[model samples]
Target: AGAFVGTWKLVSSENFDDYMKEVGVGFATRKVAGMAKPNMIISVNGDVITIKSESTFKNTEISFILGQEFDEVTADDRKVKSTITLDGGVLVHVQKWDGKSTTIKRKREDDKLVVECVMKGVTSTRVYERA
Candidate 1:
């Protein structure tokens, strides 16, 4: 298993600005988001999984079961249809908004957690270390 049921601290980020740009985030919001290093906590209870992000800038939490599609309001505050599924040891997420689609995948490697986001041609990778 990937073993993601712990806190993860942001270690590095790449192309996140371009990813947000492709996702239509505004300038001020993008800058604010880009500057913050967030921590993620993953928890599970029976069938429900919860992923929470905490930062000085903002905090958000989402809970869902694997393969369940649901309505979501993202950290960007955008309304979307979202779902997540597990493949191998990775959690693959899909979010669709305003006729645009994005994918985010998360996988943990021993003490390192990697998140990859993609929209259009822009791909962003963010890494986190166990905390």
Candidate 2:
């Protein structure tokens, strides 16, 4: 679990725009997001974890305890209820709002962090290298 504690830079992304569309993200915002290479800062203390994404488009952060639900505001500014759980070595993050839900799983692959975002069947893969 502590292995994910590091700064990760966005290296590659697959079908990210399509995934954003599924989440009803604004067209203009999506374009800005697409052009920005965000840095993910992950840190943990006791049972709580903090994930921060810093980018030119916008910065987002969330801090919550494992296995607990918390209020969240997504990068797109969607107000949602979020829950994060650790499954083996994977961090499963779920956000739900207005009957819609999305799952984002982050796992350490070798020395890189691999993120998979899924919503209603459409999926996006984002790869990040530790910095």
Candidate 3:
């Protein structure tokens, strides 16, 4: 399994609607965002993780820590707080933004790490192989 450090690219995303809703993205925007292949570059320093998504539509940049909570400003003008923690074999993120809450998980599987974003009305899963 690859270390949960360094830069990880967002090659693709599936079921992003789940994530969008969780992040307080509206249905129309989610529809549009779900179509694009948003790429991501991440940097890990100590316990803090910074991620930047390079996309043609709306770009995203966020930083947070494992087992720590932080506020995020979404593209659609929303304020949300998120916490990431470890659970068994997976790293989990519990986010409270707007009036809802969502959870995201990441874990190793074989030579890749799988990430899942889960929430009401939407759920997305993605798998990444080491570069």
Candidate 4:
């Protein structure tokens, strides 16, 4: 968590549109999502971490501790159970919804933040720069 305590601005995204489609995002929502570049703010204290993704279309806030499982409502309105863990230098989040699972990994490289997401066999990667 110490390595990931700061603000990050989205720099680029790959395959996110298809990934959103696979996750059942509505057409209009997807259109807006495809055009928005969200900023992510992370705060860590002891074992607890709070993540906020802010954009014009939607703003999402999630708080959880490493190795603990909790219920969450996703940005797209899906109810899920989420668990986060630290693997190497990456923060790995596993979410279960509707009997399906998605994994998201976040890590820092130099002054950039890298996020990788996979769900329903579709994968996407989003890169962010320090803000």
Top candidate, metric lDDT = 2
Query: Each model's TM-score, in the order given?
Result: 0.96, 0.98, 0.74, 0.96
Candidate 2 lDDT at 68 equals 96
Q: For residues 1-131, what per-residue lDDT tens digits would candidate 1 score against the true structure?
A: 33989899999999999999999999888999998899999999988999999998899999999999988888889999999999998999999977889999999876799999999999999999988
Measure candidate 4: CA RMSD: 0.9
Which candidate's TM-score is highest?
Answer: 2
* CA lDDT, every model vs. true structure: 0.92, 0.93, 0.71, 0.92
**Whole-model lDDT for model 3 versus the true structure?**
0.71
lDDT of 4 by residue, 27-101 (tens): 998999988999999998777899999999999999998899999998889999999999998999999987889
Candidate 3 residue-wise lDDT, 16-124, digit = tens: 7667776667888888777775555566777677767667778888888776778876666677787877678677877686578877787767766678888886778
Question: What pairs collide in candidate 3?
Answer: 10-40, 18-122, 18-123, 67-84
**Could you tell me the C-alpha RMSD of candidate 3 in Å?**
3.0
* Deviation (Å) of 82 in candidate 4: 0.3
Candidate 1, after superposition: displacement of residue 99 in Å? 1.6
Clashing pairs in 4: none
Error of 2 at 42 (Å): 0.5
Candidate 3 C-alpha error for residue 99, in Å: 4.1
Q: Is candidate 1 or candidate 3 better by TM-score?
A: 1
lDDT of 2 by residue, 87-128 (tens): 999999999999999999999999999999999979999999
**Lowest-sum lDDT 10-residue window in model 4:** 1-10
